[PDB]
């Protein structure tokens, strides 16, 4: 029979008012014989009607996947509203319901510790810059890098790690050509999290 997965919005989308967060209800293993899927969506138990219906798409072995996307309001998500996807299909004994919402608990503001290139690092042709981001709650967070108002994409970020006080931490590492660092260019890690003022902070590194 079909399976249902309800994906939360991307943290960056819920935190930036200019972006559009959405929850995504994914139904896989829909049979060729009983392929109609009906979606009902609810926000705190109240039915909403603005979801997009996507055309079914082919999977292997005579099945389809069928997806429905509901745009959410940033403030609704951040206020802890519950989004429910109800999935109806003839092959299902009963409709499948999934509910998702933001993690509960007191939000806590991320702190950042920066780390410039090690002594050994400065001998190579590429250097690494690090931002350790810590003490935040919920674990939903977005970390990106930039320099001189342009994005810097050559970075890797660990998953959030649970700390002993129930907050989270991670690190992000940007790797750049050493010449760009030696020139004196400033590189910054931008952090977006709901507990920050205006959801945003930035820390900077340059050759000192």
């Amino acid at each position: 029979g079909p399976s249902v997965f309800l994906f939360p919005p991307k943290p960056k989308d819920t935190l930036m008012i200019s972006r559009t967060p959405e929850v995504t209800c994914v139904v896989v293993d829909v049979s060729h014989e009983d392929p109609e899927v009906k979606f009902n969506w609810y926000v705190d138990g109240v039915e909403v009607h603005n979801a997009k219906t996507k055309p079914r798409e082919e999977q292997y072995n005579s099945t389809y996947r069928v997806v429905s996307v509901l745009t959410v309001l940033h403030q609704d998500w951040l206020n802890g509203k519950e989004y429910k996807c109800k999935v109806s299909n003839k092959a299902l004994p009963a409709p499948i319901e999934k509910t998702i919402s933001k993690a509960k608990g007191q939000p806590r503001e991320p702190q950042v510790s920066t780390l410039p290139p090690s002594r050994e690092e400065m001998t190579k042709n590429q250097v690494s810059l690090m931002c350790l981001v810590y003490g935040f709650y919920p674990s939903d967070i977005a970390v990106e890098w930039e320099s001189n108002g342009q994005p810097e994409n050559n970075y890797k970020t660990t998953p959030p790690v649970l700390d002993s006080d129930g907050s989270f931490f991670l690190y992000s590492v940007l790797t750049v050509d050493k010449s760009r660092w030696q020139q004196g260019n400033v590189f910054s890690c931008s952090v977006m999290h709901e507990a920050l003022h205006n959801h945003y902070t930035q820390k900077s590194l340059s050759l000192s």
């Binding site: 008012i17 108002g149 342009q150 931008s190």
Partner: peptide, 13 residues
């Protein structure tokens, strides 16, 4: 009092 990220609006207070 608004925060901007790479020219895009983040949030306002």
């Amino acid at each position: 009092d608004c925060a901007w990220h790479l020219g895009e609006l983040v949030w306002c207070t």
